[PDB]
């Protein structure tokens, strides 16, 4: 069921939590899986999205799960487990390879890539493995930082992106660059340096094999999430390498492995849409999905100035890219207070929507 109401979920009274009212969702990056062991409601009915809403360092407390049950949202646990050596605003990529099972608990591997530094204020390419394992009533964690020793074909460290992949050992895509200041650089860092490259990243063998294509150089700061079920993956706008030309987008760009039974024939195309107004990106993030279409937020809850168009604002854009007659409509826009920082919650063949914000800790629902 798409086009469902707001559901401003229930806030935290800070009665058994820390002194933040759980408002520390600013600068956060995480993942979530519909998964078993209902350790937050032992009922024969409530299927539960298991989740760890904090996976960061200098953004917040170190890591933290959440009480995303079947329907409602509350608190169920407070961690500071593996207390903050971690990364800045980086990424939170696709789950790692599964491990041999145990009688009572299940295994998880999280990859973290890219980001700033809370100490040097420069680039970082912290490839990070984190082992996560869930038994009932508690969990554990292990940290596996891997610097450039195990890294083969090291990509340039850079600012910001998301990462998508087939669930084992395959391509992980399209970081976003920094005009980094170095020694003798501090004047006029408004230049434009570029790579704009494919790179297939095997998850176990740490090797960024760059896939062959004549490279479309621009537009690498935001993107969408890869879709299953006659698969596709789309990049969305937000950058012109300079911070001076806007990214008023009227088209999309499909990066997709063409014949997915093997991993071959990497091509590129663009498709113009039934454009509602203009300017797909409000220079911010949407990246979320649906089951036969996209769910793309991102607009200005507060109208920071678009450079050339006076277009962008907080509403939802939904793209019918799965249709060969690729058009753009809207769902009924639940104009809550939300905007400008959303994170996804998808499900296949059905619409089940969750989301976070900066400090308006709420739920985006459709």
């Amino acid at each position: 069921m798409s086009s469902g109401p707001i559901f401003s979920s229930l806030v935290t009274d800070s009665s058994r939590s820390s002194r933040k009212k759980s408002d520390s969702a600013l600068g956060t990056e995480f993942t979530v899986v519909c998964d078993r062991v209902p350790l937050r409601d032992p009922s024969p009915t409530v299927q539960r999205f298991l989740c760890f809403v904090f996976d960061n360092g200098s953004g917040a407390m170190s890591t933290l799960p959440i009480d995303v049950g079947g329907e409602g949202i509350s608190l169920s646990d407070m961690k500071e487990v593996k207390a903050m050596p971690h990364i800045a605003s980086g990424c939170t990529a696709v789950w790692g390879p599964p491990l041999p099972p145990k009688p009572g608990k299940d295994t998880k591997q999280v990859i973290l890539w890219g980001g700033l530094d809370k100490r040097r204020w420069c680039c970082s390419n912290d490839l990070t493995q984190v082992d996560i394992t869930i038994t009932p009533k508690t969990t554990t964690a292990k940290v596996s930082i891997l610097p450039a020793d195990k890294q083969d074909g090291v990509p340039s460290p850079r600012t910001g992106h998301t990462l998508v992949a087939i669930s084992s050992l395959q391509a992980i895509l399209f970081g976003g660059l920094e005009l980094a200041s170095r020694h003798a650089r501090l004047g006029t860092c408004a230049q434009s340096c570029k790579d704009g490259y494919f790179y297939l990243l095997d998850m176990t063998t740490l090797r960024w094999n760059k896939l062959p294509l004549p490279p479309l150089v621009p537009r690498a700061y935001h993107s969408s999430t890869w879709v299953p079920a006659s698969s596709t993956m789309v990049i969305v706008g937000g950058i012109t390498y300079s911070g001076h030309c806007p990214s008023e987008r009227l088209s999309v760009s499909d990066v997709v492995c063409l014949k997915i039974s093997d991993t071959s024939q990497y091509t590129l195309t663009e498709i113009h849409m039934e454009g509602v107004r203009d300017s797909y990106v409000s220079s911010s993030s949407a990246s979320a999905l649906c089951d036969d279409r996209f769910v793309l937020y991102g607009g200005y809850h507060h109208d920071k100035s678009g450079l050339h168009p006076p277009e962008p604002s907080r509403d939802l854009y939904v793209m019918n890219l799965q249709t060969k007659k690729a058009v753009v409509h809207h769902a009924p826009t639940r104009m809550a207070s939300a905007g400008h920082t959303c994170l996804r919650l998808i499900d296949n063949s059905v619409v089940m929507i969750g989301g976070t914000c900066k400090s308006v800790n709420c739920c985006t629902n459709l």
């Binding site: 100490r119 200041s181 911070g243």
Partner: protein, 553 residues
């Protein structure tokens, strides 16, 4: 009739007269018609002369401290606003100042305009410290400003190593631990505990400082002929809370107490003397490439370190002036512990009542002859009363059992006798036998605590007294002191910083006003001005000592 504008500019600054008040006095004596001071349009011509960035090396002033875009919130920009200079221009403009001093400073040799012949070896110091609770404005935005400010300045001390076999110091800037010889570099409104920002503002200044240090330069096209210099610095104004949260280490410590040696918390022994230097970075990588909290955990650590080690030259750091506060909080604590017959430093539920009551009694008794209003956050004026040669009996007068009284006065007497090493501006030119015996004398002073007291707490500054002072002054190619290398010139500068902002500078807009703080605070400390202003001859009265009488009056 009419006058010199530099005379007027020197006249304004010692008044701390704001610019409109000088315009008002000009208008008043203009309306009365007196051939007097210059108009302000005659001032602001040469006001841009003394601004930095008017020389070359081996054009807009007052650069913004963000230096990236506005319309694109992709980088999470932290809450900070301020104005900084390029550091090298700030070095060079001060180098333009003391050029005429070197002219009368190259005496008994001469050979003055010989550029490849006599290379001058200068050496200086720097440091930074935060602030607290400065007023906040309307700001017209969606994020606040967290109340506080960062300042970064630097002094100039000596200019002679690479000279003759008769290697003679020729200029010392005689004050030197004060305001009016502090040139500003960074003023900004920010915060440093939930920091994020020192790597934004202060970080690139240190990355410039690395390219500055240990290089022969030339003050290129100075005035007619050029002049070369060899720049050298000494970062030690970085007092303890700044020391470890950006020198990598952990503040309270409890396993390793010094930012120079490797020492156990529980060692009141003879010495350590080890001098760890930049090794910790490697022990970051072994924690970074292997098992962040579960590899070499308290195993290989000479000292604990979380991050990858900002500002560079870690073999040199201590303060002198910002130890009297902790020495007073040590010794008054010891006197309170002696006042009621207790032991074992704590606040136990049957002991801290005695402790607090005896402390209140000591406060009232010290009030009945001297002054102590507050309790927490001691001041240096309250420090210097506790070490003056008199008033020793008044500090122990409630302590009965006179053997403990004699020992308590004796330990303080050792402290007075051996306190003259630090807070002396130039040892190795005075008290040199004390300089060559201070290590054994301080071992004796720690020995006096060792036998007359079974307590022995070693706080983070006793290890910076009973060691790390003899060899520190003794060390070759340093300076040879700690006293003139101290960090009080910033702090009285902070007394000016509110004073030059709170109803002094431009008001109505934060970023446009803090720039005008920094501009007049740069103009405040040119020696070219203070040599031209307030320099008269007082009427002599035979050195104001005696006719033949009356050391007082």
């Amino acid at each position: 009739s009419c006058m010199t504008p530099e005379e007027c500019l020197g006249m304004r600054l010692d008044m701390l007269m704001t610019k409109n008040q000088y315009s008002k006095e000009y208008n008043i004596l203009k309306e009365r018609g007196f051939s007097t001071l210059c108009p302000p349009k005659q001032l602001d011509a040469i006001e841009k002369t003394l601004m930095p960035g008017t020389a070359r090396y081996s054009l807009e002033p007052d650069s913004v401290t963000m230096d990236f875009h506005e319309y694109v919130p992709d980088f999470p920009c932290p809450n900070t606003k301020g104005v900084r200079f390029p550091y090298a221009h700030a070095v060079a403009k001060t180098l333009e100042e003391l050029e005429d001093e070197i002219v009368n400073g190259l005496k008994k040799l001469g050979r003055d305009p010989n550029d490849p012949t006599l290379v001058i070896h200068t050496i200086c110091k720097d440091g930074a410290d935060g602030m607290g609770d400065v007023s906040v404005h309307k700001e017209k935005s969606d994020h606040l400003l967290p109340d506080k400010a960062l300042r970064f300045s630097f002094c100039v001390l000596r200019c002679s190593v690479m000279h003759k076999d008769t290697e003679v110091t020729i200029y010392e800037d005689p004050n030197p631990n004060s305001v009016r010889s502090n040139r500003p570099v960074l003023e900004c409104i920010g915060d440093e505990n939930d920091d994020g920002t020192v790597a934004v503002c202060v970080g690139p200044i240190e990355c410039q400082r690395l390219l500055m240090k240990d290089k022969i330069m030339r003050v290129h096209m100075s005035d007619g002929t050029q002049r070369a210099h060899y720049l050298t610095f000494f970062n030690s104004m970085v007092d303890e809370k700044w020391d470890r949260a950006h020198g990598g280490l952990a503040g309270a410590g409890s396993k390793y107490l010094c930012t120079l040696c490797e020492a156990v918390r529980d060692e009141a022994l003879e010495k350590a003397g080890s001098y760890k230097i930049t090794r910790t970075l490697k022990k970051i990588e072994v924690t970074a490439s292997k098992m962040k909290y579960e590899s070499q955990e308290k195993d290989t650590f000479g000292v604990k370190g979380y991050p990858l080690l900002t500002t560079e030259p870690w073999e040199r750091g201590i303060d002198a002036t910002h130890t009297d506060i902790n020495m007073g909080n040590y010794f008054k604590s010891l006197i309170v512990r002696e006042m009621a017959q207790v032991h074992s430093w704590a606040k136990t539920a049957n002991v801290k009542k005695q402790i607090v009551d005896a402390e209140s009694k000591l406060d009232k008794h010290l009030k009945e002859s001297l002054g102590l209003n507050p309790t927490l956050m001691m001041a240096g004026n309250y420090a210097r009363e506790l070490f003056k040669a008199e008033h020793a009996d008044k500090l122990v007068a409630l302590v009965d059992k006179p053997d403990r009284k004699s020992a308590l006065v004796e330990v303080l007497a050792k402290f007075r006798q051996l306190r003259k090493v630090y807070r002396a501006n130039w040892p190795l030119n005075d008290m040199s036998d004390e300089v060559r015996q201070y290590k054994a004398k301080a071992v004796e002073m720690a020995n006096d605590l060792k036998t007359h007291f079974p307590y022995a707490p070693c706080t983070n500054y006793l290890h910076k007294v009973i060691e790390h002072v003899q060899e520190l002054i003794e060390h070759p190619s340093g300076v040879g002191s700690v006293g003139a290398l101290s960090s009080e010139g910033n702090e009285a500068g902070n007394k000016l910083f509110r004073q030059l902002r709170l109803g002094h500078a431009r008001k109505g807009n934060t970023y446009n006003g803090l720039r005008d703080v920094l501009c007049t605070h740069w103009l405040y400390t040119s020696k070219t001005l203070r040599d031209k202003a307030a320099x008269x001859x007082x009427x002599x009265x035979x050195x104001x000592x005696x006719x033949x009488x009356x050391x007082x009056x």
